[PDB]
């Protein structure tokens, strides 16, 4: 309940934030692992029918074109959603933004200066 | 005597500053009082306007109900003559 | 130009990704190196598509949060 | 709701875009169709100022915008702005992606073909809907009344058209389309207000004059008697408070603004009023269905909401028509959204479910598919 | 003020006595031991700053926890440590929003007591139920029962 | 020195006078500010009640206009009926 | 602090130069902008007598100097003295070399171009700053209030200007700049003090009259009643001790000096007071943003610190304005430094960080760059 307990609560919230950041990083690591595991397959092309290899390369190129088309469609949709989200956030900021701008206070000099000012000429050791 | 004179000068400085503080406080007090009177007048005007509007609304409600009843009676008569 | 804009995105992306591909003259080594380049392109496309799907999920979350704050604005 | 798929009943209109899912009673989102770029310079940095406010957002910042409607008279004159309006309607007012919903636009009769073809091309290429269908704005208003005959006068804000229908068979040779509508009445009111001293010029103040017209104007039962009464007594002068104070008093401008409908000579138009183009539209029909059309005259559209028009029009037609026929004017209280209610009913029908213009059909015949069997 | 309250609490009894010696240096002539606008104003005039009592009263209100309008020895200590500022910028709003979403595993747009206690169990430290209720009440001024984006932002407003 | 001590004495007299007047003015100013807050709150409540009454009166007038127009129309209709 | 780079928010003003680093609450050094050469001969040798005392040093030796302000009405009339003032401000009051700090000057609206161009040329050639930006003195005062709309009346000491702003879009056609300000009030007070016997003539005694004006004068709520009261009772006569004794008693000169603001006919100026130029500035705006400007009238600048002006101005505008609108006058206690606080806030913004006039840009286009996109 004390101010020490409030500092403990703040430190606990900071630790929770750090744990969430670590879990986000490990989730990204898992995403990379799963993406590498599930996506494609390596190719061995040693000493085969080279015209047949060329035809297989052409079919793979067609598949790559299809994948690129789908990727570009999803890319355009993602960009449009990003623009819409930016517009909505701008609307929210214009609605309830305003004078929530923080500032700092520096007119009051440190406690040592205040104490030496109140002591007068006595303040020499501290 | 010179020490007493210096203390006297310090006291006069303190006196002048205290007079400044007192006069500023008085001026703030009287200005706030004037604003208070003005707000009182404004509240009185708002009371007047609201009461007038309420009386208007009651009269409008009664006349509306009367005209509605007349309208329904004429509707029935129109259906009969149809 | 809207229909032209759709045709333009699709056709110009195709033209950027289309090349004069003559697999006949290439030997085994060049053919396999071209396949490796294609696999690198596939890796890039899949990585950016997964980034796009994660961005899509974040977009849905952001939309939900914006709706909640709109509700809180009354 | 759940599985399944609902249709989007959009209704472009001219002045108010009305949209909503099929099967409801009222449109979900109704907002003016105006796109206004800012016109001043702008000095605050980081305020998040956009380049174009559309829809109902530009009716609140209209003090520093230049609003411009993208639809002049039924036809669409500025395709980029119309595309922007549609995009806003789909994504922000309904929040449903168009990739998973059929659409049912509406179009005035006798409009240019290129407008309709461009509309379908946009809907299929940009928004990429599954299937869209374009319907005449008067047949829907006849659906909403629950009739199957009758001659409907749909006096919108862009254009007033008068489509007679009998037993479900429309009569294409008897459609009388007149280009006087709510916008011309707003301009004429703004022009006659200058006779008292009030000058409205800016495109933003046209909205204020529109509000005055909506809230104060009414149609006189007899014009000359009202002109004589307003010139002697002062029982008509109703006052109205501008968006900043300085109340104004409207005298005989009250019933002179909407009188233009019955005497289009006021704004210099040659044609006859809406009281006589209906009678002419009836007389072009066959001699055996005139009684039914006389008895089932339907009113629709926004501009037919003036207090006292359903009596003036009946009096005028009774004067014109033969004395034996009974003249009845159907004026439902839900006049403004009558077209959209009819659109919802039509989209909710099972028999209609195979009339949509499917996307594969458009891919095979191009945008000119709309004029074909799928009308 | 909260970080300053924590710093004063972290002082031992000896450090509190040293700060009370500082207090006596500051509060010379104070009737109630509380530095109202009078002593603070005379000290400011002595310092070379020429303020108005509004700023001092706002400093009090950030630290006046009872509503008495005075600044007692504890509140005076917060006034003392107010001479230096470090709680600035509130960390990063984007970071806090992302970590709040991570906290909101159900993505409801607000934080529930269930996920809060789940994260507390993950930390595992001793929990003060009264302080938890106070935090929930302060966040839920609208009385919704769940901590929101603005609610938790104002929880960390001015905090570090 | 005698004159300086006289000055010290009158200084202390002025100090006491000024400080007492200052305390009285501060107390009165606080009371006035409290009363001003009270009157301002009452004024704001009256203003909002007036706004509500305005909205009510407007709605009533709209309804009355509609009903009156329908009444006049049906009255003309009944005349033609007879 | 540490790494990184902070901006210098200087604010030339006319009467008090206010400066300080960006991101604080109050200016670091505030001192009068006067440069006074000695005028007598000087007989002591080796006393270390300089040739010109600037800033706050010449307010202590003013007994043997001839103080002369380098800024008359917003515009700068004596460029060498202004350069001296800037050099003092940078090197002795802040002790930061300008080679490592961006600067943000402020300028009144509707000022001559040559003044602004010479200002930027000096800042880039003599002091050699990295980048400087010039901002209108009213937009900053609107920043400090935390608003985004409102019409701000910034009655400084040189010139009083009244810039209306809505939603961040400034209205350039509604700026009403009037050249009555604190200096003319000082001269008029010095001129009416002669009616009791006190004659102040020397340019040094103008400072004494300024102190009298600051400490004693107040704005009357109603002018005629105060004139009648001061002519019967004696409850207004407040005394003041000159820098050498001989106390003076100011009678009805107390509220007659600042009354010139609301009746500029006193000093022979034709124009209307600050109570009516605000209403005229509002009425030039569009009809739909007048309510917001009425409700958010902002006061700033030093001269608006007279005790009782925020009530007189509200009474006057309420008399002029329509009875329905609510008139509210924002008068923050930190009025004097409002422009500088706003300047600090603007310089601390991240969105603003790319609007500075970088030195390479000046090298490519010359001093006329300030009128270009980088305003
Ligand atoms: N209550 C009303 N009274 C009078 N006129 C109205 C009223 N409501 C709308 N209007 C007029 O009708 C127009 C709206 O017509 P609407 O039916 O929306 O056109 P559209 O067919 O394009 O949808 C407005 O411009 C306005 O001038
Ligand atoms: N407390 C005060 N009461 C009355 N007038 C004042 C007060 N403080 C300053 N002034 C007047 O305002 C002027 C200072 O205005 P200021 O805002 O510094 O001008 P600038 O815009 O050039 O900075 C002084 O010349 C003085 O006449
Ligand atoms: Mg329509
Ligand atoms: Mg200024």
Query: Is E140 a domain residue?
Result: yes
Pocket test for ligand 2, best of G163, G214, G254, G339 (most atoms within 8 A of CB): G214
d(CA G206, CA D55): 60
For testing the chain A interface, which of E48, E96, E105, E128 should be mutated: the one with the most A CBs within 10 Å?
E128
Rg (CA), chain D: 22
Interface of chain A against chain E, CB under 8 Å? 1-10, 12-13, 15-17, 19-21, 23-24, 102, 104-111, 113-115, 117-119
Q: Do F69 and D221 touch (CB under 8 A)?
A: no
Tokens of A34: 């799963």
Alpha-carbon span D217 to D257, nearest angstrom: 7
Domain boundary among E81, E101, E131: E81
**Domain presence at residue E159:** no
**G148 vs F74: CA distance, rounded Å:** 54
Q: How many domains does chain A have?
A: 2
Q: Do the beta carbons of residue G108 and residue G78 sit within 8 Å?
A: no
Three-state secondary structure along D83-142? Answer: HHHHHHHHHHHHCCCHHHCCEEEEECCCCCHHHHHHHHHHHHHCCCCCEEEEEEHHHHHH
Ligand nearest to the CA of G107: 4
* Residue A61 belongs to some domain of the structure: yes
User: What b/e readout covers G187-208, taking b as 16+ CB neighbours within 10 angstroms?
Assistant: ebbbebbeeeebebeebbbbbb
Q: How far apart are CA B18 and CA B21, in angstroms?
A: 5
Quick check: is E158 in a domain? no
* C-alpha to C-alpha distance for G209 and G191, rounded to whole angstroms: 10
Residue whose CA is at the smallest distance from ligand 2 atom 23: G13
Q: Which of D339, G130, A97, G241 is nearest to B12 (CA)?
A: G241
If phi > 0 it is left, if psi is from -120 to 50 it is alpha, else beta; for residue D128 that is left
| Cα–Cα distances in angstroms (integers) from residue B15 to residues F10, F15, F49, in the given order | 11, 6, 51
How far apart (Å, rounded) are the C-alpha atoms in residues D110 and D76?
Answer: 14
Q: Do chains A and F touch (3 or more CB pairs under 8 A)?
A: no
Number of structural domains (chain E) is 2
Are β-strands G357-358 and G329-330 bridged in parallel, bridged antiparallel, or unpaired? unpaired
| Residue A121 domain-assigned (yes or no) | no
Using CA atoms, how far apart are residues D17 and D19, in angstroms rounded to an integer?
A: 7
Decide: residue G114, CB within 10 A, 0-12 exposed, 13-18 middle, 19+ buried.
exposed
The secondary structure of G52-81, three-state, reads CEEHHHHHCCHHHEEEECCECCCCECCHHH
> CA-CA distance, A43 to A45, in Å (whole number)?
6
In a domain, A39, yes or no: no
Do E16 and E65 lie in a common domain? yes
C-alpha distance from G39 to closest chain B C-alpha (Å): 34
Distances (CA, A) of E101 to D118, E118, G99, G349: 44, 15, 45, 27
**Cβ atoms of D161 and D18 closer than 8 Å:** no
Work out the minimum CA distance from C70 to partner chain A, whole angstroms.
8
Same domain, A26 and A67: no
DSSP D226-273: HHHHHTT--SS-EEEEETTEEEEEE-THHHHSGGGGT-TTTTT--S--
Tokens 């509220």, residue located: G255
Contacts by C58-67, CB closer than 8 A, 24 or more apart:
C59/A78, C59/A81, C59/A82, C59/A85, C61/E101, C61/E107, C62/A85, C62/A89, C63/A85, C63/A88, C64/E107, C64/E109, C65/E101, C65/E109, C65/E149, C66/A85, C66/A88, C66/A89, C66/A92, C67/E109
* Other Cβ atoms closer than 10 A to A114: 22
Strands in F1-82 per DSSP E: none
Give Cβ neighbours of residue E78 (< 8 Å, ≥ 6 apart). E1, E4, E5, E8, E59, E62, E63
From residue E82, alpha-carbon distances to A6, A109, E26, E60 in Å are 18, 9, 14, 10
**Which among D38, D19, D22, D36 has a CA at the least distance from the CA of D92?**
D19
- Is B65 buried (19+), middle (13-18) or exposed (0-12) by CB count in 10 A? exposed
Query: Do E32 and E61 belong to one domain?
Result: yes
Cα E94 vs. chain centroid, distance in angstroms?
23
**Residues that constitute the known binding site of D for ADP:** 14, 18, 157, 213, 302, 305, 336
Given a contact cutoff of 8 angstroms between Cβ atoms, the answer to whether G35 and G65 are in contact is no
Token reading at E133: 């209720």
User: With DSSP H G I counted as helix, E B as strand and the rest as coil, what are the percentages for chain G, rounded to 5?
Assistant: 40, 20, 40
Chain centre to alpha carbon of residue D244: 30
Measure the CA–CA gap between G140 and G120, rounded to whole angstroms: 19
Q: Does A57 lie in the same domain as A19?
A: no
- Inter-chain touch F65–D307, beta carbons under 8 Å: yes
Report if residue E69 sits inside a domain: yes
Residues with Cβ < 8 Å from A98, sequence gap 6 or more?
Answer: G146, G147, G148
Which residues are CB-contacts of C21 (< 8 A; sequence separation ≥ 6)?
A58, A61
Contact A39 C17 (CB under 8 A): no
Range of the domain at A30: 1-34
Q: Which residues contact G260 (CB under 8 A, 6 or more apart)?
A: G180, G184, G185, G188, G266, G267
Q: Identify whether residues A68 and A94 lie together within a single domain.
A: yes
Q: Which structure tokens are listed for D218?
A: 């009414």
Which SS3 state, helix, strand or coil, does residue D178 take? Answer: strand
The answer to whether D98 and D90 have CB atoms below 8 angstroms apart is yes
Distance CA G166, CA G285 (A): 10
CB burial class (10 A; 0-12, 13-18, 19+) of residue G101? buried
Same domain, E23 and E61: yes
The finding on whether D210 has its CB within 6 A of some atom of ligand 1 is yes
Q: Which long-range contacts (CB under 8 A, 24 or more apart) does F9-12 make?
A: F11/B8, F11/B11, F11/B12, F11/B15, F12/B11
Residues of B in Cβ contact (< 8 Å) with F14: 15
Closest by alpha carbon to G14, among G82, G86, G78, G72?
G72
Structure determined by: cryo-EM
CB contact set of D8 (below 8 Å; sequence gap of 6+) = D19, D20, D21, D22, D90, D94, D96, D98, D101, D102, D103, D104
CA E92, E95, E98, E104 dihedral sign is negative
Task: Examine residue E27 and state whether it is found in any structural domain, yes or no.
Answer: yes
CATH number of E43's domain: 1.10.238.10
Domain boundary among E81, E106, E136: E81
Is the Cβ–Cβ distance between G24 and G11 less than 8 Å?
no
- Of A50, A69, A81, Cβ closest to residue C56: A81
What percent of the residues of chain D are helix, what percent strand, and what percent coil, each to the nearest 5?
Answer: 40, 20, 40
Question: Contact D29/D340 with Cβ under 8 angstroms?
Answer: no
Q: Say if the Cβ atoms of G289 and D45 lie within 8 Å.
A: no
The residue whose CA is least distant from atom 4 of ligand 1 is D214
Task: Evaluate whether D155 touches D264 at the Cβ level (below 8 Å).
Answer: no
- What 3-state DSSP class applies to E67? coil
Cα–Cα dist D92/A80, whole Å: 13
Chain breaks in chain D (C to N over 2.5 A) after: none
Query: What phi and psi values does residue D55 have, to the nearest 5 degrees?
Result: 65, -145
Q: Is D295 a pocket residue for ligand 1 (Cβ < 6 Å)?
A: no
User: Which residue reads 């959204």 in tokens?
Assistant: D337
Q: What region does E142 belong to: left with phi over 0, alpha with psi -120 to 50, or beta?
A: alpha
Q: How far is CA G106 from the centre of its chain?
A: 11
Which residues form the domain of E141?
93-153
Percent helix, strand and coil across chain B, each to the nearest 5? 100, 0, 0
Q: Is G17 in a helix, a strand, or coil?
A: strand
In angstroms, rounded to a whole number, what is the distance separating the alpha carbons of residues B44 and B39? 9
Residue whose pair of structure tokens reads 């050099």 in the numeric block? G87
Q: How far apart are CA D345 and CA D368, in angstroms?
A: 27
Q: Which two tokens stand for residue G303?
A: 């001269």
HEC-encoded secondary structure of D306-363: CCCHHHHHHHHHHHHCCCCCCCCEECCCCCCCHHHHHHHHHHCCCHHHHCCEEHHHHH
Per DSSP, the residues of G280-341 read: HHHHTS-TTSHHHHHHTEEEESGGGGSTTHHHHHHHHHHHHS-SSS---EE--TT-TTHHHH
The packing angle between helices D182-192 and D205-216, to 10°, is: 100
Tokens 């940078």 sit at which residue? G90
Give D12 Cα–ligand 1 centroid separation in angstroms: 13
**Å from CA of G123 to ligand 2 middle:** 26
Calpha distance C13→G236 (Å, rounded) = 84
Burial-class residue D56 by CB neighbours within 10 Å (0-12, 13-18, 19+).
middle
Nearest CA to ligand 2 atom 2: G214
Distance CA G116, CA G106 (A): 10
Mapped to the 3 state alphabet, what secondary structure does G83-115 carry? HHHHHHHHHHHHCCCHHHCCEEEEECCCCCHHH
Cα separation of D339 and D9, whole Å? 10
Spatial contact of D152 and D165, defined as CB atoms under 8 Å apart: yes
Of E57, E81, E105, the one marking the end of a domain is: E81
């Amino acid at each position: 309940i004390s101010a020490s307990r409030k500092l403990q609560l703040k430190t606990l919230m900071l630790q929770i934030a750090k744990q969430e950041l670590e879990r986000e990083a490990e989730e990204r690591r898992g995403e990379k692992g799963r993406a590498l595991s599930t996506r494609c397959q390596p190719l061995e092309l040693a000493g085969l029918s080279f015209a047949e290899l060329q035809d297989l390369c052409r079919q793979l190129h067609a598949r790559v074109d299809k994948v690129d088309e789908e990727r570009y469609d999803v890319e355009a949709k993602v960009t449009k959603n990003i623009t819409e989200i930016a517009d909505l956030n701008q609307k929210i900021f214009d609605l309830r933004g305003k004078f929530k701008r923080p500032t700092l206070r520096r007119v009051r000099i440190s406690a040592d200066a205040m104490m030496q000012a109140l002591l007068g000429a006595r303040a020499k050791e501290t | 005597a010179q020490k007493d004179e210096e203390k006297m000068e310090i006291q006069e400085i303190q006196l002048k500053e205290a007079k400044h503080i007192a006069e500023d406080a008085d001026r703030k007090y009287e200005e706030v009082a004037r604003k208070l009177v003005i707000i009182e007048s404004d509240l009185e005007r708002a009371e007047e306007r609201a009461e007038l509007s309420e009386g208007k609304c009651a009269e409008l409600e009664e006349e509306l109900k009367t005209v509605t009843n007349n309208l329904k009676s004429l509707e029935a008569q129109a259906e009969k003559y149809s | 130009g809207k229909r032209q804009t759709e045709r333009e995105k699709k056709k110009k992306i195709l033209a950027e990704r289309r090349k004069v591909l003559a697999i006949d003259h290439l030997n085994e080594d060049q053919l396999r190196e071209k396949a490796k380049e294609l696999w690198q392109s596939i890796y890039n496309l899949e990585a950016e598509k997964f980034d796009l799907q994660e961005k899509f999920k974040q977009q849905k979350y952001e939309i939900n949060v914006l709706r909640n704050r709109i509700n809180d604005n009354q | 709701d759940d599985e399944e798929t609902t249709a989007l009943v959009c209704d472009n209109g001219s002045g108010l875009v009305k949209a909503g899912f099929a099967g409801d009673d009222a449109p979900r989102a109704v907002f003016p169709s105006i796109v206004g770029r800012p016109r001043h310079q702008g000095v605050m940095v980081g305020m998040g100022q956009k380049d174009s406010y559309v829809g109902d957002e530009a009716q609140s910042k209209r003090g520093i915008l230049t609003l411009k409607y993208p639809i002049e008279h039924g036809i669409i004159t500025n395709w980029d702005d119309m595309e922007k309006i549609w995009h806003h309607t789909f994504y922000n007012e309904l929040r449903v992606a168009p990739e998973e919903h059929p659409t049912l636009l509406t179009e005035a009769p006798l409009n240019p073909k290129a407008n309709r073809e461009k509309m379908t091309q946009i809907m299929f290429e940009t928004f990429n809907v599954p299937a869209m269908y374009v319907a005449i704005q008067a047949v829907l208003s006849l659906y909403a009344s629950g009739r199957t005959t009758g001659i409907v006068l749909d006096s919108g804000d862009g254009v007033t058209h008068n489509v007679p229908i009998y037993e479900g068979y429309a009569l294409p040779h008897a459609i009388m389309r007149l280009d006087l509508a709510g916008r011309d009445l707003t301009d004429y009111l703004m022009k006659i207000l200058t006779e008292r001293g009030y000058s409205f010029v800016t495109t933003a103040e046209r909205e204020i004059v529109r509000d005055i017209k909506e809230k104060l104007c009414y149609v006189a039962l007899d014009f000359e008697n009202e002109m004589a009464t307003a010139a002697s007594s002062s029982s008509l002068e109703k006052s109205y408070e501008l968006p900043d104070g300085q109340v104004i008093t409207i005298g005989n401008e009250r019933f002179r603004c909407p009188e233009t409908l019955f005497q289009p000579s006021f704004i210099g138009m040659e044609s006859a009023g809406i009281h006589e183009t209906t009678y002419n539209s009836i007389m072009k029909c066959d001699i055996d269905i005139r009684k039914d059309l006389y008895a089932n005259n339907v009113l629709s559209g926004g501009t037919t909401m003036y207090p006292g028009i359903a009596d003036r029009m009946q009096k005028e037609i009774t004067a014109l028509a033969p004395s034996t026929m009974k003249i009845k004017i159907i004026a439902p209280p839900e006049r403004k959204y009558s077209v959209w209610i009819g659109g919802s009913i039509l989209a909710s029908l099972s028999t209609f479910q195979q009339m949509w213009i499917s996307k594969q059909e458009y891919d095979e015949a191009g945008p000119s598919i709309v004029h074909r069997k799928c009308f | 003020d909260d970080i300053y309250k924590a710093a004063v609490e972290q002082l031992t009894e000896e450090q509190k006595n040293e700060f009370k010696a500082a207090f006596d240096i500051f509060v010379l002539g104070a009737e109630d031991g509380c530095i109202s606008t009078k002593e603070l104003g005379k000290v400011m005039r002595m310092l070379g700053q020429n303020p108005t009592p509004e700023e001092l009263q706002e400093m009090i209100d950030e630290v006046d926890e009872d509503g008495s309008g005075t600044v007692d020895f504890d509140e005076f200590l917060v006034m003392m440590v107010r001479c230096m500022k470090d709680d600035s910028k509130g960390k990063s709003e984007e970071e806090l929003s992302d970590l709040f979403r991570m906290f909101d595993k159900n993505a409801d747009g607000y934080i529930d007591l269930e996920e809060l206690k789940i994260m507390l169990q993950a930390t595992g430290e001793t929990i003060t139920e009264d302080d938890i209720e106070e935090l929930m009440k302060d966040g839920d001024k609208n009385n919704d029962g769940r901590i929101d984006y603005d609610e938790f932002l104002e929880f960390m407003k001015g905090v570090e």
